[PDB]
Write a protein that binds this ligand. Structure first.
Ligand code: CDL
Ligand code: PC1
Ligand code: 3PE
Ligand code: SF4
Ligand code: SF4
Ligand code: SF4
Ligand code: SF4
Ligand code: SF4
Ligand code: FES
Ligand code: K
Ligand code: ZN
Lengths: 108, 210, 96, 125, 388, 96, 176, 48, 113, 115, 264
């Protein structure tokens, strides 16, 4: 689809959060997010990242990564199947297709 | 070995051998051993006074009839009703004799425990885990510091009185441009269930009336 | 059985609707309030009553092990039909 | 070899709890009352410690029950009444102790149901 | 201390093991001190298990070593069964060995291929995950989930093998030795690979035992120890296989041991398929195992036991056990304490990766920085179980 | 499977294996996706008589640990178990 | 029973020494590694053409949740709360009351799909096959709020997917 | 379907160019398969 | 004949196993002489130590000696003797034979609570 | 009994010594921390916070409780000196997002039922 | 005193006042004998037969609830004979019992469920059809689902001896024996709601509380009634910050274990 296997943080276009975000790890994830050049999108993969999942009531777990970074697509599952993640990425492509940055700029 | 398809068979030769070795250890280290018990599923435990850790662990490692060369695990259990609320458990493995043994001791919030790193280098990280989660201090430990919890984390989560969700939660604040900790507020409180049945299940474990 | 409130919001089968002055109905502005349109109460009324010829009748909801647990229903009372606790099907005793 | 320490044992400073939930919390020590819907008595054997109930409100989105109290679901089990008090003091909680209520032994007789001159005679079985 | 390089794998690469913050002191190219910091995937799993019944706690064990899902389940089930004093039926013991060896293959493909991927050899990774993808189908057909099966439960297994599964497993196993051979045609005799693994991270036998190592980490140094052979637990006493033993204790022998374990797993899987016996799949004792959905909708006693099993749960007699299995990564053990109720009082998880990673500093001494990548890989570290 | 003979010869030669015998992909040697319904067996406790739970209750046959020595309450030396036996080299492939 | 993975002794005849010298200088094994990669270039790729082609699943697959009905149309759920009690993630929240016709029916049934671990314990525990995990695995959303299912959503999923769900139950209910 | 392909490619769908009043000549997604065919397309069954 | 490899990494071969052991066992017997005759450790460690030492004298062949001792390779037996020796020297300092240092509180080892 | 094994101090005089030392290390550190971590507080605000943390534990008189308080304070220092913490951890001491919480009866009465 | 005689309970000597039953003798060594018809605040019935227990050297089992102990009896509360008596009696109780646990408010706090798990068998051998009983309307407070009734006659004894009302009794005979009022009557009394608590099964349930909650999800708050000056001790059941029901709390000197219907 044109989605490279491995991308560096500072050439990346989309961040995929695949697992539990603990409180110890949250500062590092926001650091990486800020270093990403725009346009930047976040994909939240699985219950843990979506809202805490099965450690939602833990003392050491962020209850969803949307508390740290803005999320564009939420992929449910524990884990989502590889096909379910692929559906999520293809949903991000359609979300990008509908952007109207220039069209808004013209009417400003 | 009986024709009871659903019931775990008893190995009685293992029970006899483990009971013989429980006496042997009690006879040799009477200064420290406080109790010896072998369970029904064949697992020997030696209870010791907290001061006999190094002598007891050393004897089991080096003796020509022990040779428990491997520390399989090291953990603490919190029982708040006991005066010494913390019970420190050592699971050891002997490859020469293909046997396992458990060594248990106890402490409180303000009593240090001798580090076993001099005996088993495996205990270095195990004791850091015990300190972090249970707040049990080990004396003479090469490098005691948190290993699991976040930096600046107040409290010891694996104590029975530490709340499940803790006291503080993290989010990102736009105004201060960093991740901020704040008092925890749950949109849905964890729902506590009372599941214990009011009828006794196991008479063999009935405790004598007050 | 989907009737609307005076404001314009559809009522759910549980009977819930946002009153006139509740701000929480803003969440539907530009979007929609999802309401299942097949009301279980109205569908189970339509089912005909089952005339039978014994005092006790057993219902399992159909399908054997794909239904609900099997329940035996008493039909001695004449003033009313006998209803299944699980599936809501009604029974009556025939000419008796 | 050893030292002599005599002060009342207190650990509030090193436990890690915030001050708000040490000082303003009222622990309750009691044996649970038997659930009258059942006759079993196996849940009235041990002493429990619990804290005062605090506010719960409806989540604006889904109507769930939201709490800001971090001790709401905390329950501790003790063998004896002293242990519960001993634990509560060293953690510096204000507590109240409720004495165990033991069922009073009773005189039961089957023959009493068929009595020549007493009102205990039963009119039915 | 020429310089301290705080190496955070925070911006993670395609390894998926987790995230490791590594703090090192590099006196030039050499490494003088290594200090792993491992709190990043700590989720409070052991405390959460105290608020769940024994059945509710089982899925937590899928999510420890999340490349050994059904082996972690078996350890929990063997521990609980031991406290319950019950026995799973013979058919389930064969299914649990069969899927225990399908899980060992799953783990070693990840272990060897991601180890090689970090050292630049990307291609075998893709070759073998086409095979793991076919193994993920066996998981999904018996449990409905590709990864976290929740299939091995105390008393046996949740459901029976669907008709036609054993044929598909045999077809997979028939073509699989060739897949391993292709992998060795790219790594076993490759001088570049050998230069990156031979005489790297050497561990002596004496230091291995004292540091708590298990699994390949012992057998690479020549220690003849395998729990499946010395303390067998299901039907492993009824299957013939050989234990691979190393001679030099380096990465290359540990790489060879894992590749030979994959061959012995296929050997074992062959025997399980032929010896699979008939019968029931869970212990026929409804105060522990739920009854069949047909019986629960017909029988009063079955409905009562169904109702209580899925609400209160079965009560476990008071006691404490330490149960360990030969997990693919090493000795995986749980110290489980029962207070007599239906919820565990304490569940301590013994992760083999916890000790191995603590032994990293010992192994990294006197090696270049690029070797540390090879040392961590040969340990087979997943931070789900390191942290719990 | 649909490779021409020439390309089949090439990839066989390059790898040194007869790849067509053990193809990585699956075609029609796989099980049918629809299978006949099963008829699973019952366990050993599905008996209508001589099947009293008190004679097959594993949980109630456990007992509290024995206490070999306790503080309140010419013998030969013993190892915790007989010394483990030396393993024997495989006679299937002793040297890899 | 054990085997030695690497305990060979290399032969020290000239013919063998020359074999290793030829290997070292002529890069023989490295060429062999190039051969294997060349063979794969002419093997057929395992890729499938998603979304036009889909990966194989089974009847037991655990996907999106739905609430079912009886053939008559009455809801199967009787609000026993066995699913709420078993749920390992506490993802289910139930309230009930007597319906206008005296029936035992829920007024709130919610699944926090971001709490759920998709374990399928709730369908194992349901006595009336009211809650099931469907075959849908393609329901990712753009906002978190779209993944908090109330009763209407799960009833709509049951109406949407009943045709497939019933067939999957038919295929597996005998194993269950 | 073409049963001489390998397992996973032997069945496929060509999505309609319009569905529920939305132009899907280019924009198609896996949620356009109705439940009756969803079972066949994912090989959960063997019968269309 | 002499083993090229012990089989264990970091454990080199012993050229003179019989003599090396005899020195270690004799040292162990000598060290035990400093422990009170009543203490249980002295009685048991002497018994095993003597029984092994008697075999060492009796058996000249290295392979046959290992099969009698059943302690693995003969280098492993030497490594174990060195551990027993160092253990005895540490026991003389610890003095485990003395009566119990202290008894646990009333309900210290009571499970369930 | 009152015979208890000691952590480090055998009486409050030794304990107060280690307390005094640990305050020296923190007092020197704040100037460095405010720079390495690029904090927005002044070194005065930082040193007041160290004074505040030490003051809250004034009443303590048990020698063992003081040892642990010092042990924990040194571990906190070791994290800040070695820069294992991050800018977020260091600034958590200042609670700069939590809004003012009243402490007079009427104020608590208006807002909620909390005592 | 010299009144006390000595009995053994599994070999454990206990001294009991003469006239104490076997069931009470077992309670002193901390055991609870299973029961359905016995209630300590009602007259002994002895009809459910779940309390049957073995006396050593005694060929027959005795109803522990209604059997005075005699000097030098060893009560075997866990012998094979005692266990099999319990399994047999539980089988008979569950033979005609409806499969209602999912729809029964008593589910999760049911003595029939819990004692079936602890003392009964794990499976059924009953291969016939079951009994079905019509429901009686005894008022707006107690809901009657009499197919679940196990005929322990507790409600009858409570109304007769505690409430002083003789509306409830058993009409019929044999397997057809039914509990009710025979005529269309409402058992309306200030203490009427108490028969809900003593009924061990879902035969009598609270109409206001029907279907709303399950026992395991409710938090118990011990409090006091304020609807009168007696100060009855109650339990306030709450779930997610909502008051679900009021239950009695045992206080021997105040309300024993009853409450009024205004309290309830
Ligand atoms: C480079 C130098 C060599 C050129 C060789 C060209 C060639 O035909 O090789 C493929 C051709 C097929 O190789 P194969 O792996 O045995 O066939 C696999 C399937 O059976 C193939 O069977 P199939 O039924 O699946 O084939 C259907 C195929 C129909 O097309 C083909 O089958 C071959 C098309 C290649 C034409 C060149 O459908 C298509 O995809 C055609 C659409 C266009 C695809 C792009 C092809 C053109 C590439 C060159 C463009 C620039 C000029 O090569 C051979 O037959 C071997 C003979 C030696 C070739 C040298
Ligand atoms: C060196 C050669 C390399 C190969 C070729 C490289 C690619 C070249 C082809 C791409 C050119 C695209 C140019 C647009 C750049 C992206 C614009 C965008 O993303 O939107 C952000 C912005 C949107 O504006 P904005 O102001 O709304 O964005 C900021 C929003 N706030 C304020 C909230 C922060 O787009 C632009 O700025 C467009 C700049 C002008 C583009 C040229 C328009 C000329 C045609 C209209 C005039 C016709 C009159 C008759
Ligand atoms: C690309 C096509 C590769 C063909 C498949 C691989 C192959 O056939 O090479 C194997 C062959 C034997 O190598 P080997 O297995 O190590 O045993 C040799 C004993 N000395 O290895 C060889 O004989 C290859 C030798 C190639 C000659 C050296 C390369 C010279 C490069 C300049 C031309
Ligand atoms: S698979 Fe499940 S438990 Fe594991 S990281 Fe993903 S959401 Fe969390
Ligand atoms: S699948 Fe498992 S986690 Fe999800 S709702 Fe059902 S029981 Fe709960
Ligand atoms: S979905 Fe099933 S288990 Fe859950 S409340 Fe409804 S009937 Fe009970
Ligand atoms: S009375 Fe008890 S056993 Fe009978 S249906 Fe109700 S809960 Fe089930
Ligand atoms: S209605 Fe209840 S209390 Fe009355 S006899 Fe029947 S089961 Fe016993
Ligand atoms: S309790 Fe004794 S027969 Fe009912
Ligand atoms: K009742
Ligand atoms: Zn029905």
């Amino acid at each position: 689809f044109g989605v490279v296997f491995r991308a560096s943080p500072r050439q990346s276009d989309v961040m995929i959060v695949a697992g539990t975000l603990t409180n110890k790890m949250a500062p590092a994830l926001r650091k990486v997010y800020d270093q990403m050049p725009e346009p930047r999108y976040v994909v939240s993969m699985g219950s843990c990242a979506n809202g805490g999942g099965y450690y939602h009531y833990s003392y050491s777990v962020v209850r969803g990564c949307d508390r740290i970074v803005p999320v564009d697509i939420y992929v449910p599952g524990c884990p989502p199947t590889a096909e379910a993640l692929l559906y999520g990425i293809l949903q991000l492509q359609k979300k990008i297709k509908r952007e109207k940055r220039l069209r808004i700029w013209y009417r400003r | 070995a009986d024709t009871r398809p659903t019931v775990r068979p008893r190995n009685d030769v293992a029970h006899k051998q483990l009971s013989a070795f429980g006496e042997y250890v009690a006879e040799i280290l009477p200064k420290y051993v406080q109790q010896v018990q072998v369970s029904c599923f064949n697992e020997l435990e030696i209870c010791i006074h907290p001061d006999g850790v190094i002598p007891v662990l050393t004897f089991l490692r080096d003796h020509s009839n022990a040779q428990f060369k491997s520390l399989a695990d090291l953990t603490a259990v919190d029982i708040p009703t006991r005066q010494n609320r913390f019970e420190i458990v050592y699971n050891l493995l002997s490859l020469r004799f293909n046997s396992r043994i458990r060594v248990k001791t106890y402490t409180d919030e303000l009593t240090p425990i001798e580090s076993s790193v001099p005996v088993y280098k495996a205990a270095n990280w195990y004791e850091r885990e015990i300190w972090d989660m249970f707040g049990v201090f080990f004396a003479n430990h090469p490098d005691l510091r948190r290993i699991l919890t976040d930096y600046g984390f107040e409290g010891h989560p694996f104590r029975k009185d530490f709340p499940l969700s803790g006291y503080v939660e993290l989010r990102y604040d736009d105004e201060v441009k960093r991740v901020v900790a704040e008092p925890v507020e749950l949109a849905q409180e964890f729902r506590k269930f009372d599941l214990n049945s009011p009828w006794e299940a196991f008479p063999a474990y009935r405790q004598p009336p007050e | 059985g989907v009737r609307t409130s005076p404001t314009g919001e559809k009522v759910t089968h549980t009977g819930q609707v946002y009153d006139d002055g509740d701000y929480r109905k803003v969440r539907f502005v530009g979007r929609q309030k999802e309401v299942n349109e097949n009301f279980a109460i109205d569908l189970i009324a339509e089912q005909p009553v089952s005339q039978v010829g014994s005092r006790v009748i057993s219902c399992d909801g159909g399908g054997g092990a794909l239904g609900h647990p099997r329940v035996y229903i008493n039909l001695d009372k004449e003033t009313k039909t006998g209803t299944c606790g699980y599936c809501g099907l009604q029974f009556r005793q025939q000419h008796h | 070899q050893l030292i002599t320490v005599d002060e009342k044992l207190d650990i509030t400073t090193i436990t890690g709890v915030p001050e708000e939930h040490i000082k303003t919390r009222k622990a309750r020590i009691f044996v649970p009352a038997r659930n009258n819907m059942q006759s079993g008595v196996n849940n009235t054997k041990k002493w429990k410690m619990e804290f005062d109930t605090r506010e719960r409100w409806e989540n604006p989105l889904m109507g769930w029950a939201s709490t800001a109290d971090p001790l709401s679901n905390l329950v501790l089990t003790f063998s004896t009444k002293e242990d519960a008090v001993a634990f509560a003091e060293k953690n510096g909680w204000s507590y109240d102790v409720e004495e165990r209520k033991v069922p009073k032994p009773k005189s039961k007789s089957y023959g009493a149901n068929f009595s020549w001159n007493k009102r205990t005679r039963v009119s039915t079985k | 201390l020429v310089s301290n390089l705080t190496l955070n794998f925070g911006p993670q690469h395609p390894a998926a093991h987790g995230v490791l913050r590594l703090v090192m002191e590099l006196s030039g190219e050499m490494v003088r001190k290594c200090d792993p910091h491992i709190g990043l995937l700590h989720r409070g799993t052991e405390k959460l298990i105290e608020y769940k019944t024994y059945l509710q706690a089982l899925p937590y064990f899928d999510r420890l070593d999340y490349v050994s899902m059904m082996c972690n389940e078996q350890a929990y089930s063997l521990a609980v069964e031991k406290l319950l004093n019950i026995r799973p039926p013979p058919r389930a013991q064969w299914i649990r060995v069969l899927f225990g060896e399908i899980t060992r293959l799953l783990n070693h493909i990840m272990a060897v291929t991601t180890h090689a991927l970090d050292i630049g050899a990307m291609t075998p990774f893709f070759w073998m995950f086409e095979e793991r993808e076919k193994m993920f189908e066996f998981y999904e057909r018996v449990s409905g989930a590709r990864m976290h099966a929740a299939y091995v439960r105390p008393g046996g297994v949740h459901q029976d093998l669907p008709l036609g599964l054993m044929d598909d497993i045999y077809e997979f196993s028939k073509n699989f030795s060739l897949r391993i051979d292709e992998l060795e045609e790219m790594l076993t005799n490759n001088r570049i690979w050998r230069n990156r693994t031979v005489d790297i991270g050497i561990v002596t036998a004496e230091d291995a035992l004292n540091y708590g190592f298990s699994g390949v980490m012992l057998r690479g140094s020549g220690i003849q120890w395998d729990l499946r052979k010395t303390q067998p637990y299901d039907v492993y006493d009824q299957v013939e296989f050989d234990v691979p033993i190393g001679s030099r204790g380096d990465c290359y022998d540990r790489y060879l041991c894992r590749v030979e374990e994959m061959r012995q797993s296929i050997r074992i899987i062959s025997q399980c398929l032929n010896k699979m016996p008939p019968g029931e799949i869970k212990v026929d004792d409804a105060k522990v195992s739920p009854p069949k959905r047909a019986e629960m909708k017909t029988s009063m006693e079955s409905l009562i036991h169904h109702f209580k099993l899925y609400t209160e749960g079965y009560q476990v007699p008071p006691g404490a056990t330490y149960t360990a299995i030969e997990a693919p990564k090493g000795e995986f053990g749980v110290y489980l304490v029962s207070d007599g109720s239906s919820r565990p009082y304490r569940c301590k998880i013994k992760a083999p990766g916890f000790a191995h990673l603590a032994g990293l500093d010992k192994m990294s001494k006197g090696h270049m920085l690029a070797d540390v990548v090879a040392i961590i890989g040969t340990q087979d570290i997943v931070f789900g179980e390191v942290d719990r | 499977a649909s490779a021409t003979r020439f390309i089949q010869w090439l990839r066989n030669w390059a790898s040194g294996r007869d790849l067509q015998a053990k193809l990585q992909l699956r075609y029609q040697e796989i099980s049918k996706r629809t299978q006949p319904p099963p008829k699973l067996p019952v366990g050993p406790s599905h008996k209508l008589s001589n099947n009293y739970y008190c004679t097959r209750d594993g949980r109630r046959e456990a007992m509290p640990p024995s206490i070999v020595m306790s503080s309140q309450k010419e013998k030969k030396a013993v190892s915790p178990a007989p010394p483990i036996k030396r393993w024997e080299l495989s006679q299937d492939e002793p040297y890899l | 029973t054990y085997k030695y993975v690497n305990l060979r002794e290399p032969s020290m005849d000239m013919k063998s020494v020359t074999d290793r010298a030829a290997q070292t200088l002529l890069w023989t094994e490295l060429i062999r590694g190039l051969g294997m990669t060349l063979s794969y270039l002419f093997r057929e790729p395992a890729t499938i053409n998603y979304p036009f082609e889909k990966g194989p699943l089974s009847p037991r697959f655990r996907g999106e949740h739905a609430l079912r009905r009886y053939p008559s149309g009455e809801e199967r759920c009787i609000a026993c709360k066995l699913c709420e009690a078993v749920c390992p993630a506490q993802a289910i929240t139930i309230e009930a009351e007597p319906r206008a016709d005296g029936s035992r029916r829920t007024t709130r049934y919610d699944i926090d799909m971001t709490k759920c671990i998709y374990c399928g314990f709730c369908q194992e525990a349901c006595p009336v096959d009211a809650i099931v995990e469907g075959p849908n695995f393609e329901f990712s959303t753009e906002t978190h709020e779209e993944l908090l299912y109330n009763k209407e959503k799960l009833l709509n999923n049951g109406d949407k997917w009943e045709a497939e769900i019933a067939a999957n139950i038919q295929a597996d209910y005998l194993y269950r | 379907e073409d049963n001489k392909q390998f397992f996973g490619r032997h069945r496929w769908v060509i999505y309609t160019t319009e569905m529920n009043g939305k132009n899907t000549f280019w924009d198609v997604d896996g949620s356009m398969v109705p439940p009756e065919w969803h079972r066949w397309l994912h090989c959960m069954t063997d019968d269309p | 004949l002499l083993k090229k490899t012990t089989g264990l990494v970091g454990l080199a071969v012993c050229e003179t196993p019989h003599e090396r052991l005899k020195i270690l066992y004799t040292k162990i017997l000598d060290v035990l002489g400093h422990i009170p005759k009543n203490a249980a450790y002295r009685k048991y460690t002497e018994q095993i130590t003597n029984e092994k030492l008697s075999m060492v004298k009796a058996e000249p062949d290295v392979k046959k000696l290992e099969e009698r001792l059943q302690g693995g390779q003969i280098e492993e037996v030497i490594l174990q003797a060195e551990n027993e020796l160092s253990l005895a020297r540490k026991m003389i300092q610890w003095k485990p034979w003395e009566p119990l240092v202290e008894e646990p509180p009333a309900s210290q080892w009571k499970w369930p609570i | 009994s009152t015979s208890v094994k000691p952590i480090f101090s055998r009486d409050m005089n030794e304990a107060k010594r280690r307390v005094r030392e640990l305050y020296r290390a923190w007092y020197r550190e704040v100037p460095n921390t405010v720079h390495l971590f690029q904090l927005d507080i002044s070194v005065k605000q930082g040193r007041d916070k160290v004074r505040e943390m030490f003051k809250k534990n004034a009443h303590i008189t048990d020698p063992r409780v003081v040892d642990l308080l010092v042990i924990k304070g040194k571990m906190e220092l070791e994290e800040t000196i070695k820069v294992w913490k991050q800018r977020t951890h260091v600034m958590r001491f200042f609670h700069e997002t939590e809004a003012p919480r009243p402490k007079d009866f009427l104020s608590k009465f208006y807002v909620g039922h909390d005592p | 005193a010299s009144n006390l005689i000595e009995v053994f309970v599994d070999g454990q000597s206990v001294m009991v006042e003469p006239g104490t039953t076997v069931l009470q003798a077992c309670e002193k060594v901390g055991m609870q004998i299973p029961r359905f018809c016995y209630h300590e605040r009602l007259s002994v019935a002895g009809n459910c037969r779940m309390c049957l227990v073995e006396i050593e050297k005694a060929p027959k089992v005795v109803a522990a609830c209604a059997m005075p102990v005699m000097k030098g009896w060893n009560i075997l509360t866990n012998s094979e004979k005692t266990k099999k008596a319990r399994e047999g009696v539980m089988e008979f109780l569950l033979a005609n019992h409806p499969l209602d646990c999912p729809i029964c408010d008593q589910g999760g706090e049911c003595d029939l469920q819990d004692q079936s798990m602890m003392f009964g068998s794990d499976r059924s051998r009953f291969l016939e059809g079951k009994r079905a009983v019509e429901d009686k309307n005894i008022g707006p407070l107690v809901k009657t689902i009499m197919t679940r009734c196990i005929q322990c006659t507790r409600c009858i004894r409570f109304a007769s001896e505690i409430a002083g009302v003789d509306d409830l009794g058993t009409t019929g005979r044999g397997n057809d024996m039914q509990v009710g009022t025979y005529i269309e009557k409402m058992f309306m009394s200030e203490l009427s709601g108490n028969i809900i608590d003593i009924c061990p099964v879902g035969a009598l349930t609270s109409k206001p509380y029907a279907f709303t909650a399950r026992p395991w999800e409710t938090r118990k708050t011990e409090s006091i009634d304020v609807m009168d000056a007696v100060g009855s001790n109650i339990v306030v059941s709450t779930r997610t910050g909502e008051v679900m029901r009021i239950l009695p709390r045992m206080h021997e000197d105040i309300n024993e274990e009853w409450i009024s219907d205004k309290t309830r």
